[PDB]
């Protein structure tokens, strides 16, 4: 009966493909044929945060657009003040191998994780001075690649055992497990309403979940290699993904298909981070060729280069008010741009 | 100078800067090694010979020198994602089982393919390898009954230990093309008394070479 199920699956996929082709009338570019170009974007390095001793692997902005977490495998998780290049806490980690960091939207907790299969949650507002470990979530059988908060009492992570998890910090259990991927999931991003998120693994796909029940809603496949970064459009109806075939793609949600692809002949490297602006007109993508590029997010034409890094740019984040973009590379540094 | 109550904050910032600098200075005094291998490569035999889920880190000190051994064989996923976290290590310890007349595709062929892949990786283009060829006893017993030509058909020469081992070693060594790095070789027995000394000597030589190239004198 295996052949029968294979034939049924082939028929279902053919039906889905036919429906997707049918609903596609015209592409986004033709509708956006009239809007004027935004012109070259001049951006100069304002602050240069210089504290670490090894390659920075992740960052995350705060909610107030001023504080910033930085995680690097010198064993360090240090939080900064962007406006005055100051350090407010330094945290020594139990494990030196780190690939993720999160700053709670309430500012009370931070999270970290890496190859040692454990997501550690660090308190910040203790009554005894220093910051201490509150919980060590451990249910995964592979390395963590991303960790995002939802509120103070829960957390969402994605790990290299082809699965994702929603935890409960107070108890320590694993409130829900999402499975259905084929390879290593390496990115994660939450929609504004904190009700559904999209994750993209090394099997050239990105699937969208719902946090309440775990049933996968949609699978998007356009790429030709691993996807190493995902970010959302601000209104939660589109998202941008960055692969290792030198292209980044803007995908829709209601139209159930791909809208735009971004790639240039000069570019052959692989994307390590993708983000938007506040309005949703510019796309910022960091490359392995030691810089960052800005794409007109409705014209696909390149509109400037954020250059000045001496090695691969890994983390890239824009603030919650659109005032600056912070890029962090294996050069141990971290730069702010307007 | 226009600062008001932020003067404290800056004192705390320099205090934690001092702590970071001191921790870095104290933590640059430890050697970092990465232990690789193949299936049933005997890498469990030499990890226990050192006496004090996820990454298994073993710590030991010998002749007043820190060591750190990072077993990563517990990772069941794509290798090309987390190898780059192990750049800027001092050495890669590669263990190869000399029992080279079996199937898992001969085991030696898997070992050669893995060694070629890890030696021509872009990140480890200049990171040195200490090569252990384990099970030098069992191989000696087995060589009499079976010919080495079953593993490498091209081979022609004596069927003795002292030459078959050398041919295997040379076939392994012929996989490096960088002019800087080097492969250090040893043929540890199943239960030899002291082969931490070989690791000590190899790491001393690596440090000397790195110092010489850093000063520009090379």
């Amino acid at each position, epitope marked *: 009966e295996l052949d029968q199920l294979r034939q049924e699956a082939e028929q279902l996929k053919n039906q889905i493909r036919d429906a997707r082709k049918a609903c596609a009338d015209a592409t986004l570019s033709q509708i956006t044929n009239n809007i004027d170009p935004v012109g070259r974007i001049q951006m100069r390095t304002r602050r240069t945060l210089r504290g670490h001793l090894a390659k920075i692997y992740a960052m995350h902005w705060g909610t107030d657009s001023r504080l910033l977490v930085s995680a690097s495998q010198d064993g360090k998780l240090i939080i900064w*003040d962007s406006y005055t290049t100051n350090k*407010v*806490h330094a945290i020594p980690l139990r494990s030196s191998w780190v690939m993720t960091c999160a700053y709670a939207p309430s500012g009370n907790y931070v999270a970290c994780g890496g190859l040692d299969n454990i997501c550690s949650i660090y308190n910040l507002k203790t009554r005894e001075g220093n910051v201490r470990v509150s919980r060590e979530l451990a249910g995964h059988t592979g390395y963590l690649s991303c960790c995002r908060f939802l509120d103070d009492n829960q957390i969402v992570t994605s790990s290299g055992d082809t699965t994702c998890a929603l935890w409960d910090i107070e108890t320590g259990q694993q409130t829900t497990t999402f499975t259905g991927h084929t390879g290593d999931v390496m990115s994660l991003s939450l929609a504004p309403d904190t009700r559904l998120f999209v994750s993209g693994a090394c099997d050239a796909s990105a699937k969208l979940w719902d946090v309440r029940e775990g049933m996968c809603r949609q699978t998007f496949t356009g790429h030709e290699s691993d996807i190493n970064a995902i970010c959302f459009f601000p209104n939660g109806n589109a998202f941008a993904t960055g692969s290792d075939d030198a292209t980044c793609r803007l995908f829709d949600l209601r139209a159930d298909q791909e809208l735009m692809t971004y790639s240039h002949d000069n570019i052959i490297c692989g994307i390590t981070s993708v983000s938007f602006s506040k309005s949703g007109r510019l796309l910022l993508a960091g490359y392995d060729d030691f810089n960052c590029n800005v794409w007109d997010a409705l014209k696909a034409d390149r509109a400037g280069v954020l250059a000045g890094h001496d090695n691969r740019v890994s983390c890239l984040g824009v603030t919650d008010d659109g005032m600056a973009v912070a890029t962090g590379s294996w050069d141990s540094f971290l730069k702010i741009w307007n | 100078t226009l600062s008001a109550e932020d003067k*404290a*904050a800056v004192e*705390r910032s320099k*205090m934690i800067e001092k702590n970071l600098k001191e921790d870095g200075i104290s933590a640059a005094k430890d050697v970092k090694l990465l232990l690789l291998g193949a299936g049933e490569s005997g890498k469990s035999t030499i990890v226990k010979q050192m006496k004090i889920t996820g990454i298994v880190e073993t710590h030991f000190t010998f002749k007043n020198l820190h060591f750190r051994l990072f077993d990563v064989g517990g990772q069941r996923s794509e290798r090309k994602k987390w190898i780059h976290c192990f750049e800027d290590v001092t050495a890669i310890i590669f263990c190869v089982a000399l029992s080279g007349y079996d199937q898992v595709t001969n085991r030696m062929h898997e070992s050669l393919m893995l060694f070629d892949s890890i030696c021509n990786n872009k990140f480890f283009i200049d990171t040195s390898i200490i090569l252990f060829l384990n099970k030098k006893d069992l191989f000696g017993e087995k060589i009499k009954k079976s010919p080495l030509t079953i593993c490498f058909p091209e081979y022609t020469g004596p069927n003795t230990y002292e030459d078959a081992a050398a041919y295997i070693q040379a076939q392994f060594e012929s996989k490096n093309r960088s002019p800087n790095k080097e492969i250090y070789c040893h043929m540890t027995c199943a239960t030899d008394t002291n082969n931490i000394q070989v690791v000590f000597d190899a790491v001393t030589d690596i440090i000397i070479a790195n110092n010489l190239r850093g000063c520009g004198l090379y």
Partner: single-chain antibody, 236 residues
Framework: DVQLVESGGGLVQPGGSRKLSCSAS????????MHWVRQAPEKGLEWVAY????????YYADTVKGRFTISRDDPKNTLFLQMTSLRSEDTAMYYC??????????????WGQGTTLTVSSGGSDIVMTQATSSVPVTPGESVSISCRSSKSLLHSNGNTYLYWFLQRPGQSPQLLIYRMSNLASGVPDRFSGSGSGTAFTLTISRLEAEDVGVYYC?????????FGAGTKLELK
């Protein structure tokens, strides 16, 4: 728990010398800054000395420089004040407070218990004036208290530095509001603050019977710290 307890008090004839020890338990003592604040039997709060984390910066009041000295022993977590060549203007009860500082911190969050010392017979300092001294109140009402400085407390950083303190009868003061708007930890929602530049006000809504005592305002723009005379509260 957090505990600060002081020792070294009693009675000394004029001219002598003593040493006061404040012992701490329950927190990372080495990462804080210690202060000293004294209180005359009838008057209000006055400032004595300040020592920082790492013992880099030490500050003294004008009426104390030269005579007294301060020290700390953080491996054995105890703070010290050495007093020499005393005077009759030192008969008072002394306190021990902690002042951790960083972006978003809360200074003066815990006050010690206080040691009593008595002695027998033998221009840019910012002045802050609390207007009213006695205000009768009734439970459930709303009361607004005032504090007017002499210099504008709004720095360029967008911050202003005025702290409010409450003192119940026969206990140590507790911090209510820090930086004119922030409500501290462990304090109810009733209290709130407002003001502008120099004229600063604190509002208590639906006053209960546990909030009787005396209230104070403090400045932290520049050293030395200057308090106010305080405003008392009484029922009926």
């Amino acid at each position: 728990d957090v505990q600060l307890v002081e020792s070294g008090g009693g009675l000394v004839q004029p001219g002598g010398s003593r040493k006061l020890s404040c012992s701490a338990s329950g927190f990372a003592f080495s990462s804080f800054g210690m202060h000293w604040v004294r209180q005359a039997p009838e008057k209000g709060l006055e400032w004595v000395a300040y020592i920082s984390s790492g013992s880099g910066t030490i500050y003294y009041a004008d009426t104390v420089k030269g005579r007294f000295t301060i020290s700390r022993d953080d491996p054995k977590n105890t703070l010290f004040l050495q007093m020499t060549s005393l005077r009759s203007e030192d008969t008072a009860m002394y306190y021990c407070v902690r002042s951790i500082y960083y972006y978003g911190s809360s200074p003066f969050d815990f006050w010690g218990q206080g040691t009593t010392l008595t002695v027998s017979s033998g221009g840019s300092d910012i002045v802050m004036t609390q207007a009213t001294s006695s205000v009768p109140v009734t439970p459930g009402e709303s009361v607004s208290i005032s504090c007017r400085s002499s210099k504008s407390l709004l720095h360029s950083n967008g911050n202003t530095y005025l702290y409010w303190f409450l003192q119940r009868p026969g206990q140590s003061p507790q911090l209510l509001i820090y930086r004119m708007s922030n409500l501290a930890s462990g304090v109810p929602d009733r209290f709130s603050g407002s003001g502008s530049g120099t004229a600063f006000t604190l509002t208590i809504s639906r006053l209960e019977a546990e909030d009787v005592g005396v209230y104070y305002c403090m400045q932290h723009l520049e050293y030395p710290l200057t308090f106010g005379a305080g405003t008392k509260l009484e029922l009926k």
